[PDB]
Design a protein around this ligand. Structure first.
Ligand SMILES: CCCCCCCCCCCCCCCCCC(=O)OC[C@H](COP(=O)([O-])OCC(O)COP(=O)([O-])OC[C@@H](COC(=O)CCCCCCCCCCCCCCCCC)OC(=O)CCCCCCCCCCCCCCCCC)OC(=O)CCCCCCCCCCCCCCCCC
Ligand SMILES: CCCCCCCCCCCCCCCC(=O)OC[C@H](COP(=O)(O)O)OC(=O)CCCCCCCCCCCCCCC
Ligand SMILES: CCCCCCCCCCCCO[C@@H]1O[C@H](CO)[C@@H](O[C@H]2O[C@H](CO)[C@@H](O)[C@H](O)[C@H]2O)[C@H](O)[C@H]1O
Ligand SMILES: COCCOCCOCCOc1ccc(C(C)(C)CC(C)(C)C)cc1
Ligand SMILES: COCCOCCOCCOc1ccc(C(C)(C)CC(C)(C)C)cc1
Lengths: 68, 53
């Protein structure tokens, strides 16, 4: 269907590709290496529960007062 | 103004220079071994990673 040149990526000569840099002494920084710096939220979960309760309650209070 | 006996001195100088070059260029960087660079090779395995202890 397609020629071998198209499959292998070169007509006559295979060109050398420059390898990827590593930056020895530190972690790689790529779009896929970001969980090393940003994990899932784990520090303020209980505060999340409390604040969701208080937000629901205060919103319900003011909505009922406005409606009434 | 340049006699023929003075040539091997220049040859010695250039040999010293090219030897100082080649002793460095003979070294090359090997394959990377940092696990942080190859952790996605294990992340992308057909099975989940077993942390066995
Ligand atoms: C249940 C529906 C999902 C069940 C399975 C999915 C799942 O749980 O994935 C975890 C998923 C993600 O994990 P997460 O980080 O803990 O999410 C934060 C919680 O939603 C943060 O909320 P919370 O679960 O920590 O507590 C909030 C609290 C709030 O309390 C209230 O004031 C509600 C009062 C209701 C009356 O509500 C309750 O705990 C129980 C009351 C019923 C809700 O959380 C949920 O989806 C469950 C809560 C979703 C509630 C609203 C959904 C619309
Ligand atoms: C809104 C921003 C997305 C937050 C995603 C958190 C993250 O660091 O990202 C981490 C999560 C998954 O983390 P895991 O490595 O634990 O599976 O998503 C990704 O891996 C890539 C997100 C790309 C989008 C960046 C914006
Ligand atoms: C099958 C029925 C008949 C129809 C046949 C034609 C179908 C064409 C649609 C499929 C096209 C796929 O297109 C594909 O693109 C990639 C890029 O990702 C090319 O990829 C090429 O270039 C990349 C870099 O650019 C090289 O690293 C790689 O070695 C080389 O394969 C493929 O050579 C080509 O095949
Ligand atoms: C549009 O959104 C703006 C996004 O901006 C990204 C901000 O980036 C700044 C990040 O700065 C740092 C620098 C170092 C670090 C360290 C190295 C301290 C983090 C560590 C110890 C967790 C790896 C964390 C954050
Ligand atoms: C969900 O994620 C969105 C925002 O992502 C931010 C990712 O930020 C990570 C930044 O990476 C760094 C980390 C440290 C550094 C410094 C300069 C602080 C490192 C150092 C001092 C070792 C050279 C620079 C960039």
């Amino acid at each position: 269907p397609l020629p071998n040149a198209v499959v292998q990526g070169y007509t006559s000569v295979r060109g050398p590709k420059r390898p990827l840099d590593h930056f020895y002494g530190r972690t790689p920084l790529n779009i896929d290496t970001l969980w090393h710096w940003v994990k899932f939220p784990h520090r303020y979960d209980n505060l999340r529960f409390a604040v969701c309760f208080w937000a629901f309650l205060v919103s319900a209070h003011f909505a009922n007062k406005k409606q009434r | 103004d340049v006699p023929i006996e003075k040539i091997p001195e220049h040859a010695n100088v250039l040999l010293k220079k090219i030897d100082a070059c080649l002793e460095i260029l003979s070294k090359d960087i090997g394959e990377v071994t940092d696990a942080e660079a190859h952790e996605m090779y294990f992340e992308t395995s057909k099975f989940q990673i077993l942390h066995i202890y």
